[PDB]
Amino acid sequence: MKVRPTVSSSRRKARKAHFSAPSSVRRVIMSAPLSKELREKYNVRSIPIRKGDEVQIVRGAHKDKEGKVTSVYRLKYVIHVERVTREKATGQTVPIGIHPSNVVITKLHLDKDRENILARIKAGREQVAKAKGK
Amino acid sequence: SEKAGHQTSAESWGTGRAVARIPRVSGGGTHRAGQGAFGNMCRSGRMFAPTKIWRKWHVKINQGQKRFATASALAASAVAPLLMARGHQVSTVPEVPLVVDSAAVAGDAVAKTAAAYKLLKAIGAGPDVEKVKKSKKLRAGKGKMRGRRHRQRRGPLIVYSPEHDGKELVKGFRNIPGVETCPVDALNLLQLAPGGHLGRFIVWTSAAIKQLDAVYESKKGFFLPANIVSQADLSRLINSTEIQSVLRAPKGEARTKRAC
Amino acid sequence: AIKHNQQIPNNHFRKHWQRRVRCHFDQPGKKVTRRLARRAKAAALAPRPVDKLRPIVRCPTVKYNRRTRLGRGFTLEELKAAGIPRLLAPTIGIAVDHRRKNLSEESLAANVQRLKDYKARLILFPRKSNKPKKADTPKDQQTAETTTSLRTSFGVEQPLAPGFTEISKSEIPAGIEGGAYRALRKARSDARLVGVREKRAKEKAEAEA
RNA sequence: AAACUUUCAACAACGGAUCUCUUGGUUCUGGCAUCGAUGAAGAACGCAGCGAAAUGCGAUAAGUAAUGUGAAUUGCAGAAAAUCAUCGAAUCUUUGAACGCACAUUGCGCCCGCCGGUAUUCCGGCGGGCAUGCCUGUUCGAGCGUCAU
RNA sequence: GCGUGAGCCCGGGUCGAACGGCCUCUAGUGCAGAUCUUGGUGGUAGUAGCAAAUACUUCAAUGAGAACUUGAAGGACCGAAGUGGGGAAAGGUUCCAUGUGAACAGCGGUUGGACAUGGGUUAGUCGAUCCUAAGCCAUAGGGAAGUUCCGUUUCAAAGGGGC
RNA sequence: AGACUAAUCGAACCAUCUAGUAGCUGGUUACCGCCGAAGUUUCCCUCAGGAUAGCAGUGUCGACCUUCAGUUUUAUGAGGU
RNA sequence: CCGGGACCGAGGACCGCGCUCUGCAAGGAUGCUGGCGUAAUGGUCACCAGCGACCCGUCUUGAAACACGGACCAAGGAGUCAAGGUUUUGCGCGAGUGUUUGGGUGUAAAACCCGCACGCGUAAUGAAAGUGAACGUAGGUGAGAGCUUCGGCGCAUCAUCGA
RNA sequence: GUUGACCUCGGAUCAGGUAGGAGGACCCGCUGAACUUAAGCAUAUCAAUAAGCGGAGGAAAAGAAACCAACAGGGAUUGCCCUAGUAACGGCGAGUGAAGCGGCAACAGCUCAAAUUUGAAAGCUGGCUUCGGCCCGCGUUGUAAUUUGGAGAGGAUGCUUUGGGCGAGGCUCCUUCUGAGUUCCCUGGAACGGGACGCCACAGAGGGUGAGAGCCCCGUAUAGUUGGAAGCCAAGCCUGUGUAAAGCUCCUUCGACGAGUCGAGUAGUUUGGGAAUGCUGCUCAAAAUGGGAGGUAAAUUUCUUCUAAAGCUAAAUACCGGCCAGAGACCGAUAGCGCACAAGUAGAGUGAUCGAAAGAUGAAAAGCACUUUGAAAAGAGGGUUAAAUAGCACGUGAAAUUGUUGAAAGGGAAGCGCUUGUGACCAGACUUGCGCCCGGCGGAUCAUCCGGUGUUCUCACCGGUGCACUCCGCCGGGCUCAGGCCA
Ligand SMILES: [Mg+2]
Ligand SMILES: [Mg+2]
Ligand SMILES: [Mg+2]
Ligand SMILES: [Mg+2]
Ligand SMILES: [Mg+2]
Ligand SMILES: [Mg+2]
Ligand SMILES: [Mg+2]
Ligand SMILES: [Mg+2]
Ligand SMILES: [Mg+2]
Ligand SMILES: [Mg+2]
Ligand SMILES: [Mg+2]
Ligand SMILES: [Mg+2]
Ligand SMILES: [Mg+2]
Ligand SMILES: [Mg+2]
Ligand SMILES: [Mg+2]
Ligand SMILES: [Mg+2]
Ligand SMILES: [Mg+2]
Ligand SMILES: [Mg+2]
Ligand SMILES: [Mg+2]
Ligand SMILES: [Mg+2]
Ligand SMILES: [Mg+2]
Ligand SMILES: [Mg+2]
Ligand SMILES: [Mg+2]
Ligand SMILES: [Mg+2]
Ligand SMILES: [Mg+2]
Ligand SMILES: [Mg+2]
Ligand SMILES: [Mg+2]
Ligand SMILES: [Mg+2]
Ligand SMILES: [Mg+2]
Ligand SMILES: [Mg+2]
Ligand SMILES: [Mg+2]
Ligand SMILES: [Mg+2]
Ligand SMILES: [Mg+2]
Ligand SMILES: [Mg+2]
Ligand SMILES: [Mg+2]
Ligand SMILES: [Mg+2]
Ligand SMILES: [Mg+2]
Ligand SMILES: [Mg+2]
Ligand SMILES: [Mg+2]
Ligand SMILES: [Mg+2]
Ligand SMILES: [Mg+2]
Ligand SMILES: [Mg+2]
Ligand SMILES: [Mg+2]
Ligand SMILES: [Mg+2]
Ligand SMILES: [Mg+2]
Ligand SMILES: [Mg+2]
Ligand SMILES: [Mg+2]
Ligand SMILES: [Mg+2]
Ligand SMILES: [Mg+2]
Ligand SMILES: [Mg+2]
Ligand SMILES: [Mg+2]
Ligand SMILES: [Mg+2]
Ligand SMILES: [Mg+2]
Ligand SMILES: [Mg+2]
Ligand SMILES: [Mg+2]
Ligand SMILES: [Mg+2]
Ligand SMILES: [Mg+2]
Ligand SMILES: [Mg+2]
Ligand SMILES: [Mg+2]
Ligand SMILES: [Mg+2]
Ligand SMILES: [Mg+2]
Ligand SMILES: [Mg+2]
Ligand SMILES: [Mg+2]
Ligand SMILES: [Mg+2]
Ligand SMILES: [Mg+2]
Ligand SMILES: [Mg+2]
Ligand SMILES: [Mg+2]
Ligand SMILES: [Mg+2]
Ligand SMILES: [Mg+2]
Ligand SMILES: [Mg+2]
Ligand SMILES: [Mg+2]
Ligand SMILES: [Mg+2]
Ligand SMILES: [Mg+2]
Ligand SMILES: [Mg+2]
Ligand SMILES: [Mg+2]
Ligand SMILES: [Mg+2]
Ligand SMILES: [Mg+2]
Ligand SMILES: [Mg+2]
Ligand SMILES: [Mg+2]
Ligand SMILES: [Mg+2]
Ligand SMILES: [Mg+2]
Ligand SMILES: [Mg+2]
Ligand SMILES: [Mg+2]
Ligand SMILES: [Mg+2]
Ligand SMILES: [Mg+2]
Ligand SMILES: [Mg+2]
Ligand SMILES: [Mg+2]
Ligand SMILES: [Mg+2]
Ligand SMILES: [Mg+2]
Ligand SMILES: [Mg+2]
Ligand SMILES: [Mg+2]
Ligand SMILES: [Mg+2]
Ligand SMILES: [Mg+2]
Ligand SMILES: [Mg+2]
Ligand SMILES: [Mg+2]
Ligand SMILES: [Mg+2]
Ligand SMILES: [Mg+2]
Ligand SMILES: [Mg+2]
Ligand SMILES: [Mg+2]
Ligand SMILES: [Mg+2]
Ligand SMILES: [Mg+2]
Ligand SMILES: [Mg+2]
Ligand SMILES: [Mg+2]
Ligand SMILES: [Mg+2]
Ligand SMILES: [Mg+2]
Ligand SMILES: [Mg+2]
Ligand SMILES: [Mg+2]
Ligand SMILES: [Mg+2]
Ligand SMILES: [Mg+2]
Ligand SMILES: [Mg+2]
Ligand SMILES: [Mg+2]
Ligand SMILES: [Mg+2]
Ligand SMILES: [Mg+2]
Ligand SMILES: [Mg+2]
Ligand SMILES: [Mg+2]
Ligand SMILES: [Mg+2]
């Protein structure tokens, strides 16, 4: 249950914020879990998804399909996975939009920025665990 | 809105134009022109007797009557049939005025939800907690749009002494669905008789039970009411010797035979 | 249009009363705001009480003549008798009223004793800690259980005189000679006839010349 | 007997009721005090690779600087972030209390300075100025209103 | 199927995400009318009608389709106070070329002031701009609580020529 | 000519006061059960309206008291059709 | 005292009045038999037939009216809320009663707690100055439910004479 | 005599400044209706309101008594409760209508005029300046210090009082960070549904994700923490110093105190204010224990209470107009704002102004390739989808009204009620169940006894026994009883 006066449990406000969030907020909204191996390696549970990540689909009709994230369409709150596609009437191939929360990240695109992120998350989680274990 | 249905300059056309005498929007070049504007029977008009904010929303209740109702609800909470008739799962409860040692809740003993859940299961409120957990349903009304999205049953009410038991038990019990806590010195009728139905299942602490008498003795201007009857066993009264020895012999039976 | 045995209606709603209706849905929120302001001002007045010391005062009219309450401030005479300088009183939590007078020794003495008790209970911190003066509390009796509400710690001990009292018999006072009712009648009659008797007496005195 | 009319039923039309939904209203409560001659509110006209409107912006024109985040935007094209958040530096057309005089005119002037045409005088280009009421001060003055030599 | 009844329940079809019984609480709570409000739809009814301004015809081309497109020929009207050639107000792109499904042109339409895509308005001499008219608005002043009214040269220290 | 003053003139148009007032016209939304009228009295610038009494419903209470009666009989008055 | 016919069978151990008394026609139908066991009975709809049947709402003495509104359908559509007053219900307390102007407190518009004043009530009357309610077991008489030791004690209330 | 002062009055695109407009919910003033009620209407009421005009702020305004009172006296202002529907006003009709006291919220006090600094204009604006001062100007028709009635001034008298700088530490602010399943099975296009097994919970608020998700994602709880700016408060320290300034205790004396103002008359308006409550116009026009007030006009005599005609000032109070935020027993596309949408838009009017309609395919456009007929629009196949009768005339898809198909009726309406008949189409009921004998099959309790528990303390249960002229069940035969419809 919410307590803080700054937090609001209004369904209307929550939906408005979600569906009119700017691109930077949509980045955080479109987070995906890490695989078990990456989670053990980095002590990080979830991260915002990025183009060039390798993911495995764990929900929907395309379960168990793996591939590289080729586009993160924030405007449509979906991602595009390599070879996870569909055919139009003309036979032309179009990507299928997958929500990032329906996939798991099996391999991460890592550059100092993507990593300062992981170090911050790991340090925060470790500190919180230590403080709770005091 | 105070001005809803009145933001127009419409006037009645009068008689002689083969239309009803309702006020009509003037002008032209739009669908609105010539349409009824003000009446309660008109589209985009003003509702009949528009609701006002100075309606009597709150009800003043005598404090003496409030205290009677609270005492009556507390008394009903000690009757096992009333708990079952109100829908609580108390078949495994060891004793109806269920009292748990304050040493099991005092301080940080049940400050964690896991510990509080384990204590409830041990003392026998587990079936009621599980009933609340399984009763969750989506509301049938339009309250889903208005913030009342889910409905569920009521569980045990934990009564404690904040002076002796502390307030960590509040945090411990907060997240368990259907379980609510109340200090012994601020008992709430809305919780003691949910929906106006008597027989709330209450888990007391020993300190709270010890303090209840002083709580009720500290209420200025209120004394526990005297009932209009002394013996509630109508069977005992009617079938006692004092009454049965002076009655006249019965003039009939439960069934009367038809004579003609 | 009355139709039965009704009390004659006099509801003053012939103006546009709806234009000036004052509901009070903000009563609990206003109470919360008031409590927050009180807490903030108490924190600002960190060791001091949240209010000023007030004198005991008798309510004016013949109704309420029997009751005392808190007044606005102490008079200059009361402050002088208590030995508290006029410019120093408002800086140590004492309310000062320059326009009230002490017409009676009873009120004067009561307020002077009140001021003396307050001064005896006052703890005065030095302006600078490293050089206290002779008029300040010397850092040893500066720790004690203090009060932050002078309205409660210095309230009206008994607004009304005690309504019950026991005396031994043979100490019962003798009544007014003609009786209390007659005495009241006589006093009323004398008050009525004071002027007529005066003019008649002077007329009879001057009739000789 | 058909046709026609009517009645009943199935299917198909017409129409948009009903049900369910809701980035919207409405009402209450809490916090806050911040427009403008340093040119406001409002109006006009423009600005995108492909826009008419809405939104945003002002010839630095779907925006520039700066800070933060950290890889997009997306209808297509394109390229090596962002139609991102924040926002303290700037730009800010014609107007408008609107201020050289006007304005139903993209009208007519004056002053200072620079650059050209032979140029203090005319013409052209550029930049900066020219409203009113009042206050303080400055300077130049008027009056036998008045004071001494 | 139940109920005297308002109604309630079930079977079948359609359909796609919420909903109901019981006890209390609450109200913007029950429609055939109000020449009621909004919206939709009938009979009338393929009916009234599409008849002022003299009028059309032949061949050919185009086209799925031609009385009302075009070419040629014929027959006619307006008959210089024109159905002619240009302007003022007003409109604003209707002007020109190309193309054209639907809608509009109360019949049709290949045609169009329609729709779509692109173009088109060149001034020292023609106008505005300059002047004043009836008149309007400032100024100095005087009224008015004030928005403002009078005032237009008036009870004003109100300017332009040279070395 | 009461003519004209933007199809508006015996006082234009626009917005507001304003949901102006109406003893007057129209309408006023499920079912069943029980009871069930009045158009008469007095007063009113009262005569298409009100108040007042009557008729009606509902809720009670009292010992529902051994009384009550749109009736007859008997005895005894009044009346001027 | 004998026949002939029609409609009906309510109730569900015994109990009672009784008789023509091992029983009965006496406080309400049983016994025997047949066909069928399904659309046969029965229900619904459509139509024909016999009889019956004016268009609703409204105002009105009187409406089917040659009185007004209504072409049709869907949705909307009209005794509400507040303050004050009154009587009657249900509650709490009771010569008192009312926390919520306010304060304390809180799981924070909830719930819980606190008290000074104040309102109403506890005393009326007079314009007012003012005065201000027991002779009696808080009276006597007649009733009066209910109790009664059967002699009277007498509620509420009514009438009455008193204080 | 001229110049030179100073007094007024001017010029300047002189140097530096300031005002206008917007907004106006709330606030301070001015101006100011009528509808309406009075069952008519004129005073009255609506209303000291709407409309009009001027002027501010986050609040405004008011405000430290020329007050209330009449008491044992209260003590600036504001607001709530009460006073109180009271006193009073009113064609005394309709109707209107305060204040003192009392309880509470919040509390805050002050500075000018009127005095000679006169042993020193000690004061201030502007410019220049190393910072020490300088210059001009304002100002003696008075700028500083002192004083404001609570007093003060003048004297005594002995005590007492003061300036600067740090500042741990705490509260703020910005910033990093946050627990747990996507495990197995079924349905489904998709689990977020059902079943099984787990986990977290100071977090089971909310939202998204292909259907109801605490553990898939964002968030949610808790105090913490990473780094940073430094906004506030602050225990306590460090350090100047009494020339000056400041308070108190006593005192003979003195003791300045606001003028076309008060007050009075009259007129208008207003008020509950009534021989006149406030305000304003005009006329008259003060005084010095004087003056105002003391709710009935006047003379006289007392008393009480304050001290006008100059000024400033937080808070408690109003307001959702503006900017943010949180909520609701509210409305749910004819509702809710006129506007859920390129809505104050499209459109109308010369103009002031008036002012709509209009939300929903699907999880995803996967928005129908291709063949064929057609001039085309389109159709027919075919394809996508869980679904196309979900195909941009798109969720569902009512009625009015219409077409086709099938059945039926109809000699100047039809509909409807009661009652059969015909035709069509149907819901039930039944197809068994009870018992009792005679055979077959199977089982192990059927009585009784022993022990242990329970319980209503005498009634059961569980074990051991039983062990086939018991008990139970299932078949086969016979008999009994009842059970449907019409007679
Ligand atoms: Mg509306
Ligand atoms: Mg009104
Ligand atoms: Mg029929
Ligand atoms: Mg349709
Ligand atoms: Mg709906
Ligand atoms: Mg600008
Ligand atoms: Mg300028
Ligand atoms: Mg300027
Ligand atoms: Mg011109
Ligand atoms: Mg020139
Ligand atoms: Mg040159
Ligand atoms: Mg030039
Ligand atoms: Mg220029
Ligand atoms: Mg100068
Ligand atoms: Mg001169
Ligand atoms: Mg769905
Ligand atoms: Mg309604
Ligand atoms: Mg209808
Ligand atoms: Mg009706
Ligand atoms: Mg219509
Ligand atoms: Mg029609
Ligand atoms: Mg015809
Ligand atoms: Mg014709
Ligand atoms: Mg013809
Ligand atoms: Mg012709
Ligand atoms: Mg051809
Ligand atoms: Mg022709
Ligand atoms: Mg001719
Ligand atoms: Mg001719
Ligand atoms: Mg000519
Ligand atoms: Mg031409
Ligand atoms: Mg021409
Ligand atoms: Mg012209
Ligand atoms: Mg053309
Ligand atoms: Mg063409
Ligand atoms: Mg046509
Ligand atoms: Mg055509
Ligand atoms: Mg065409
Ligand atoms: Mg063609
Ligand atoms: Mg065009
Ligand atoms: Mg020319
Ligand atoms: Mg020119
Ligand atoms: Mg000129
Ligand atoms: Mg003028
Ligand atoms: Mg002037
Ligand atoms: Mg005439
Ligand atoms: Mg006009
Ligand atoms: Mg005209
Ligand atoms: Mg007029
Ligand atoms: Mg009008
Ligand atoms: Mg009857
Ligand atoms: Mg009369
Ligand atoms: Mg009538
Ligand atoms: Mg006679
Ligand atoms: Mg006679
Ligand atoms: Mg039959
Ligand atoms: Mg028939
Ligand atoms: Mg007939
Ligand atoms: Mg008639
Ligand atoms: Mg009728
Ligand atoms: Mg007739
Ligand atoms: Mg009639
Ligand atoms: Mg009529
Ligand atoms: Mg009609
Ligand atoms: Mg609706
Ligand atoms: Mg309806
Ligand atoms: Mg009431
Ligand atoms: Mg009381
Ligand atoms: Mg009295
Ligand atoms: Mg008796
Ligand atoms: Mg200048
Ligand atoms: Mg200026
Ligand atoms: Mg202004
Ligand atoms: Mg009237
Ligand atoms: Mg009237
Ligand atoms: Mg009239
Ligand atoms: Mg008034
Ligand atoms: Mg106004
Ligand atoms: Mg404030
Ligand atoms: Mg102020
Ligand atoms: Mg003063
Ligand atoms: Mg006094
Ligand atoms: Mg006061
Ligand atoms: Mg008067
Ligand atoms: Mg008034
Ligand atoms: Mg007070
Ligand atoms: Mg200076
Ligand atoms: Mg998390
Ligand atoms: Mg499956
Ligand atoms: Mg969902
Ligand atoms: Mg599941
Ligand atoms: Mg969820
Ligand atoms: Mg004074
Ligand atoms: Mg005067
Ligand atoms: Mg006076
Ligand atoms: Mg006067
Ligand atoms: Mg007067
Ligand atoms: Mg006035
Ligand atoms: Mg007056
Ligand atoms: Mg007097
Ligand atoms: Mg003053
Ligand atoms: Mg003053
Ligand atoms: Mg002020
Ligand atoms: Mg709407
Ligand atoms: Mg619609
Ligand atoms: Mg609308
Ligand atoms: Mg227009
Ligand atoms: Mg739709
Ligand atoms: Mg298909
Ligand atoms: Mg369908
Ligand atoms: Mg569908
Ligand atoms: Mg559909
Ligand atoms: Mg239909
Ligand atoms: Mg008929
Ligand atoms: Mg039949
Ligand atoms: Mg056994």
Author numbering:
A (entry chain LY): 1 to 134
B (entry chain LC): 54 to 313
C (entry chain LL): 2 to 210
From the paper:
We next analysed the structure of ribosome-bound ctSND3/CCDC47 by single-particle cryo-EM, resulting in a final reconstruction at an overall resolution of 2.2 Å. The map has density for a tRNA bound in the pe/E hybrid conformation as in the structure of the (TI)-POST-translational state20, however there is no clear density for a nascent chain in the ribosome exit tunnel. Notably, ctSEC61ɑ is present in a closed conformation. In addition, our structure reveals a further tight interaction interface mediated by two salt bridges between the second ctCCDC47 latch helix and the C-terminal half of ctSEC61ɑ within its cytosolic ribosome-binding domain. ctCCDC47, therefore, effectively braces both halves of ctSEC61ɑ, which would actively prevent the opening of the channel through rotation of the N-terminal half away from the ribosome-bound C-terminal half. Surprisingly, we further discovered that residues 64–91 of ctSEC61β (hereafter called the vestibule binding domain) are sandwiched between the ctCCDC47 latch helices and the entrance of the ctSEC61ɑ channel. Namely, ctTRAPɑ has an N-terminal domain positioned beneath the SEC61 channel and interacts with the ctSEC61ɑ luminal hinge domain via its TMD. Interestingly, hydrophobicity analysis of ctSND3 further revealed a membrane-embedded hydrophilic groove within the cytosolic leaflet of the membrane formed by TMD2, TMD3 and TMD4. Strikingly, such a hydrophilic groove formed by three TMDs is a hallmark feature of the Oxa1 superfamily of membrane insertases, where it provides the route for IMP substrate insertion.
In this work, we describe a cryo-electron microscopy (cryo-EM) structure of a ribosome-associated SND3 translocon from the thermophilic fungus Chaetomium thermophilum. SND3 forms a complex with the biogenesis factors CCDC47, the SEC61 translocon and TRAPɑ beneath the ribosome tunnel exit.
